[PDB]
Amino acid sequence: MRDKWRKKRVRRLKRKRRKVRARSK
Amino acid sequence: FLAERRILPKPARKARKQQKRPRSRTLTAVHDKILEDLVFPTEIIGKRVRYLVGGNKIQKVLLDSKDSTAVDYKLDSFQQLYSKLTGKQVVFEIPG
Amino acid sequence: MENDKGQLVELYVPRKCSATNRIIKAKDHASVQISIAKVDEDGRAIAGENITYALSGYVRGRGEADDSLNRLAQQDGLLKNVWSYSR
Amino acid sequence: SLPASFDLTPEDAKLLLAANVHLGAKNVQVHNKPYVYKTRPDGMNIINIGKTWEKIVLAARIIAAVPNASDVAVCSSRTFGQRAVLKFAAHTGATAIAGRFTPGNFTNYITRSFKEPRLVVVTDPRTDAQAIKESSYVNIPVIALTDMDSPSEYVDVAIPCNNKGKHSIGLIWWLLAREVLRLRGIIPDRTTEWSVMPDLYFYRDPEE
Amino acid sequence: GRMHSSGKGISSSALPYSRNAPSWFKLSSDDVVEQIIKYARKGLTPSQIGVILRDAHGVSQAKVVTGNKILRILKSNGLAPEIPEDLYYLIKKAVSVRKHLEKNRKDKDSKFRLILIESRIHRLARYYRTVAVLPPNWKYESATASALVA
Amino acid sequence: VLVQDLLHPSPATEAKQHKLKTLVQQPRSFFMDVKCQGCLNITTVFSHAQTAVTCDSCSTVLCTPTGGKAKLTEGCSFRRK
Amino acid sequence: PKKRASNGRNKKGRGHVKPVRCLNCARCVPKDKAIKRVTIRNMVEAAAVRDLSEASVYAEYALPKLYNKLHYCVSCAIHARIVRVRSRTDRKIRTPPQRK
Amino acid sequence: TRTSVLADALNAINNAEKTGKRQVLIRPSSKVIIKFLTVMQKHGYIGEFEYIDDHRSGKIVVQLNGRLNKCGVIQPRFNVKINDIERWTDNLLPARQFGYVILTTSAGIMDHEEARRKHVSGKILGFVY
RNA sequence: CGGCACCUUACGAGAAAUCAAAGUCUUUGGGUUCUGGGGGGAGUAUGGUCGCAAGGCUGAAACUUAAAGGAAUUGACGGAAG
RNA sequence: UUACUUUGAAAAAAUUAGAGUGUUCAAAGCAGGCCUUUGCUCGAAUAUAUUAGCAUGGAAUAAUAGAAUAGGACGUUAUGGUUCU
Numbered sequence A: 001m002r003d004k005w006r007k008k009r010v011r012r013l014k015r016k017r018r019k020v021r022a023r024s025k
Numbered sequence B: 001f002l003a004e005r006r007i008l009p010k011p012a013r014k015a016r017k018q019q020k021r022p023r024s025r026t027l028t029a030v031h032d033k034i035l036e037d038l039v040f041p042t043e044i045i046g047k048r049v050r051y052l053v054g055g056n057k058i059q060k061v062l063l064d065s066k067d068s069t070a071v072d073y074k075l076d077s078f079q080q081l082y083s084k085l086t087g088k089q090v091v092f093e094i095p096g
Numbered sequence C: 001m002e003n004d005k006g007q008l009v010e011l012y013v014p015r016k017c018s019a020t021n022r023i024i025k026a027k028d029h030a031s032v033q034i035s036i037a038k039v040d041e042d043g044r045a046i047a048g049e050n051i052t053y054a055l056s057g058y059v060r061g062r063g064e065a066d067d068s069l070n071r072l073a074q075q076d077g078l079l080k081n082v083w084s085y086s087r
Numbered sequence D: 001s002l003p004a005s006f007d008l009t010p011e012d013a014k015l016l017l018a019a020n021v022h023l024g025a026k027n028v029q030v031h032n033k034p035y036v037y038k039t040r041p042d043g044m045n046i047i048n049i050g051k052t053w054e055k056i057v058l059a060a061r062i063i064a065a066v067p068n069a070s071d072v073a074v075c076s077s078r079t080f081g082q083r084a085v086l087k088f089a090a091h092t093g094a095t096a097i098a099g100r101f102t103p104g105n106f107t108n109y110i111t112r113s114f115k116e117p118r119l120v121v122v123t124d125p126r127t128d129a130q131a132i133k134e135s136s137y138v139n140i141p142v143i144a145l146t147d148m149d150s151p152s153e154y155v156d157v158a159i160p161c162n163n164k165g166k167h168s169i170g171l172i173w174w175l176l177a178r179e180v181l182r183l184r185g186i187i188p189d190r191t192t193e194w195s196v197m198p199d200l201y202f203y204r205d206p207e208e
Numbered sequence E: 001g002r003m004h005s006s007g008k009g010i011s012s013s014a015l016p017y018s019r020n021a022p023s024w025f026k027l028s029s030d031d032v033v034e035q036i037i038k039y040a041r042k043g044l045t046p047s048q049i050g051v052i053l054r055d056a057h058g059v060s061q062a063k064v065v066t067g068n069k070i071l072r073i074l075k076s077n078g079l080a081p082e083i084p085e086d087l088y089y090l091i092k093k094a095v096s097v098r099k100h101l102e103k104n105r106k107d108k109d110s111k112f113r114l115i116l117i118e119s120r121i122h123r124l125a126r127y128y129r130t131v132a133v134l135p136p137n138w139k140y141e142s143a144t145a146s147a148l149v150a
Numbered sequence F: 001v002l003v004q005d006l007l008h009p010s011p012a013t014e015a016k017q018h019k020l021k022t023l024v025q026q027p028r029s030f031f032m033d034v035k036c037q038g039c040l041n042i043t044t045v046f047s048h049a050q051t052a053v054t055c056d057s058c059s060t061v062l063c064t065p066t067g068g069k070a071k072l073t074e075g076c077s078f079r080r081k
Numbered sequence G: 001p002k003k004r005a006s007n008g009r010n011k012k013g014r015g016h017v018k019p020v021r022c023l024n025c026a027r028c029v030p031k032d033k034a035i036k037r038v039t040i041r042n043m044v045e046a047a048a049v050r051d052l053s054e055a056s057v058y059a060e061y062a063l064p065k066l067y068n069k070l071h072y073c074v075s076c077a078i079h080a081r082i083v084r085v086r087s088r089t090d091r092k093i094r095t096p097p098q099r100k
Numbered sequence H: 001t002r003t004s005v006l007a008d009a010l011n012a013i014n015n016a017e018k019t020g021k022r023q024v025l026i027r028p029s030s031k032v033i034i035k036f037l038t039v040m041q042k043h044g045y046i047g048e049f050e051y052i053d054d055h056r057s058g059k060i061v062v063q064l065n066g067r068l069n070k071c072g073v074i075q076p077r078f079n080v081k082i083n084d085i086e087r088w089t090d091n092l093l094p095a096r097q098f099g100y101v102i103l104t105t106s107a108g109i110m111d112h113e114e115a116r117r118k119h120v121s122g123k124i125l126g127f128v129y
Numbered sequence I: 001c002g003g004c005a006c007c008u009u010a011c012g013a014g015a016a017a018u019c020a021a022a023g024u025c026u027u028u029g030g031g032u033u034c035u036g037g038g039g040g041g042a043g044u045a046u047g048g049u050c051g052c053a054a055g056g057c058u059g060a061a062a063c064u065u066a067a068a069g070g071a072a073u074u075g076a077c078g079g080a081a082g
Numbered sequence J: 001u002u003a004c005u006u007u008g009a010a011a012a013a014a015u016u017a018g019a020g021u022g023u024u025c026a027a028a029g030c031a032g033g034c035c036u037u038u039g040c041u042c043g044a045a046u047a048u049a050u051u052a053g054c055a056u057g058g059a060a061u062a063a064u065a066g067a068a069u070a071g072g073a074c075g076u077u078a079u080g081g082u083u084c085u
C-alpha cells in the first residue's frame, strides 16, 4: 500500500476504538 | 645601561604562604627587559628561538634597520654579556 | 635488523625515495630511478659514472617530481639558481 | 658543479628569443610557477630562458647517462614535432615514435611495436597522455618539454618551453640533440658549429 | 564564532607587535590622562575615548603610552561607571526592542531577538557576578530595566 | 610544494596576505600628519578614522570617515609618520 | 540511490521557492525546477511576409516579432520532447546544445 | 572550540608527513608542545624546529625528515599506573622494539622507557613511532 | 576577508553510488548532544501528559518469520528517447 | 587548598598463579630426607588482591586561593599606646 493510506486507515480505526470505549465510561 | 631588577623565585608547593609574586618579577619578563635594554638605541622587531637537533636552544632577535649604526659593532659584546648574565645563546640580526 | 650473533638476517634492504624518504615497494611500478651522467671539464660525459636518484610513486603521481629534482640537483651542484628555497 | 662552458650563451639566447621560445601560455599552473619570470600585461607569461637552458643541460646529461642509445624512446603526437623527432632519431640513434602512440606499446608484449625503453622523452604531456601513463606503468622516466599550462603528473624532469610553437619545438629538439651529442663526443667540442641547421627539424606544410 | 548567529567573520583589530610608544609620539603620560578624564567627564565611554584619542591625538594605545588601561585609570580616579559599558548597551538594546515589540505585537523576529539578547544579558551579568564587578544579588528585571538605562 | 621556507616568505606574497594571516600580524593602517590649506598645524590623524576630526585653529573638518580609510578633504595634504 | 547531485533543481542556500504553473497542464512546479524556454518568433510565417509586405500600405514597415517565455513541467517537457533522457555521463554536461 | 593544542599540532604534523611535506606550521605554541617536540627530536622523528614570538600564544615551524609514521595524542589524559604501561604499549605500539609512549609525570615529560628507567608514572600524553 | 555554489583529480575514504568531506577511522582517542540493534505485529494496545477537537509527545508485549533491505552487473520487458 | 602518581602499611583462611617435594605417574597432599640411626635433620615459600581509609617522596599535567577604595608584606632588637597570662 501507499503506507500513507494505511496510517490513515489506522487513524480512522483508532478513532472508532476511542468512541466505542467511551460508551462504557 | 642595564636595570637591576629583583627576581623572586617560583615558590615550592610545601613552602609557606607569602604575598602574590607579581608577573614582573618572573624569570622570563626580566630577561626580556634586559634583552631589550641591551639594544636601547634600537628597538626589537621580533624574537625567534631555534631548537637545534643537538638539544641546545639558540635565540635570535630581529632589530630595526633604523639606528642599527649604534649596536652593529657591539653585537658580540651584547651576546657575550647576555650569555654570561642569563645562560642562553643569543644571535642578533638586522634583516636589512 | 640483525640476529643475536650479529649476522644481517635481512634480505632486500629496500630503496627509499630521494624526495620524501618513503620506502619504494617491490611492486611500485610508477617509481623510477633517474641516472644523470657526470661531465668532466672538457664537456665530455664520463663513461659509467652517474648521479642516481629515486622517486616514489606518490611524488610522481602528485607532480612534485620536477620540483624535487630541481632541489636535489641544485643541492648537489648539477644546477645553479634554478630552484629557490623561498617562494 | 658544472663548468662555465655550460652557461647560457648569448648566441643561444638570441635563437631562443627570436624563436619566441620564451612566450608561455596565459594561465600558469602552480607546478609551473617557478618557470615564469613575469606576466606580460596582455596576459602572456615570460619564460625564464636561463632556467629553460639549465633544464636542457640537465636533460641532456640524463640522456647521456643511458648506455644504449636505442633504449631511449622519443615521442611526439603533435604534427609540429613529428619531423623534429624523426630527425632527432636519425641523428642520435634513438627510437622515434611519431604520430599516434598505440596504447599498450610498453605493457602489452604481444603487440607489433612493443618496445622496452629505459627512458621516454615527450613533446607534450597532454597530447601524449597515453605514453606517460604507460611509462608510469612500466617504470619509465619521462623527460618533457612543458609550457606553463602543461600538467605535471608523472613527469620527472620538465624542460620549460613553448610546446605550441613551430620554431620553438624544432629549436628545442635541435638543442637537445646538440647537447646529447656534445656529451657523447661525436662533435669534438662545444664551440664548433654543428652541420645540421635549425631549419632542418622544422615541420613543413604540404604547401611549401 | 558568533555566539548567537551562524556568521564566521574574523574582522577585528590587529595590535602591532611593538609594545613601546612610537618615536613620533610627543604627548606625555599626564596629558593623555587629562585628555581621557576630560572626555570621560564629557560623558564618553572608554571605547569612544580611545577612538577619539587615536583619531585626533595620535595615541595609538593608551596602554603603550600611559601604562594602564583606560577603564583601570578611570576606576583609579573614581570615574568608572557603575554598570559596565557593554552590559549597559545590551540592556539598553533589549529595552528598545521590548518597547518596539509592545507597540508591534505581531512581530516575531524581534521576539526571537529579544530572547537572544536577554540570554546574552544574563550570561554577561553572571560573569560579572562571578568576578565581583556586580553584586552577587544583581538581577536583570524587564519591568525595572528602564530605570537602569534611563 | 613539499619543501618551502616557511620562516622567510617572499615579501610580495607576505604583502598580499591578510593582515591577520602573516607570521606576525601587523596592521596595514598608519597615522598621518595632515596639512589643511588654511593654516599650518600638525594634527595626527588615523588613516582609518571613524571621526570627523577638526583642527583646533580653524573649525574645519579635516577628513570624513568611510568604510575603510578616512577620506581627506580637498586641499588637505598628508604625510605618513 | 541519488540520481543527481543537484536533485534535479537549482535550489542552494535557500529554503523555499514559489511555484509556477506548467503551460501545458497547469501543474504547480517550483520555478527553478521548471524547464524554461525563451522564444522569439516571427509573428508572420516566411511564406506570407512577401505578400503581406506587398499588401502593406506603409513603405518600409518592419513586421513585429512575437516574444514569449514558456514554462513546462518535467512530464510535459519530456513528453513534448523539449528535453530528452540522457546517458549517465552526458547528464553532467551543462553547456547549451550547439544548434543555434 | 579549540580543546587541544597538542592535538592540533600533531594532526598538522601527521597531515604534512602523509602528504610528503618537509615542513609544517603549528599554531599556537606551549610549554607542553615544545617539550613533546623535544622528545620527538631527541629520538630523531623530526629535525630542527623553530619557535616564533609574536607577543601572543606563539607559532611553531617544524622540519620533517620523513621518519614519522604517525604521531598522536590520547584524549583524555588518562591517569596511568606503572602496571598500566604494558597495556598501553600493547595497544598503541606496532612492536616491542621501537616507538614511545609519552607520559607526563611530576618528574617531567618523558617516554615510557625513560619512565621505566627512573620507575615513575603519570598521565599518558601521546605516542610516536 | 566572509558567503551561495561550481569544475577537475583522487593522496585518502567507502559495499558501491559517490565524497574537499561522507578524508585526516584496526597506524582505531580534538570537544559535545541525539538515535539504531534482523523483518513484521507497530508508532498498535495500555497508562501518563498536552489539545476545544483533529490529534501531538512518551510507548510495549503476546504472536509470527529466514530473511527484509543497500549499491551495482548481465539479461528480459516498457503503451520511454535516438 | 587539592586532584594525580611512587613507595610503605593493610586487604583472614580457603580458591588462583607460583617455589620445593617420585602420592609407583597424575589429580592431589604438605609432606619428607639422612647406613638404618635409643636420633640427626631442609620445609610448609611468594606474588596477586584494590574501590575507600592511613603514611610517604615528586610539583609536570588538571583545578583552587592570593596585593586594587590596598582591609597588602616585613621591621628580626623599629617608635609609642590599650589590654590579657
Ligand SMILES: [Zn+2]
Pocket: G022, G023, G024, G025, G026, G027, G072, G073, G074, G075, G076
Ligand atoms: Zn505540466
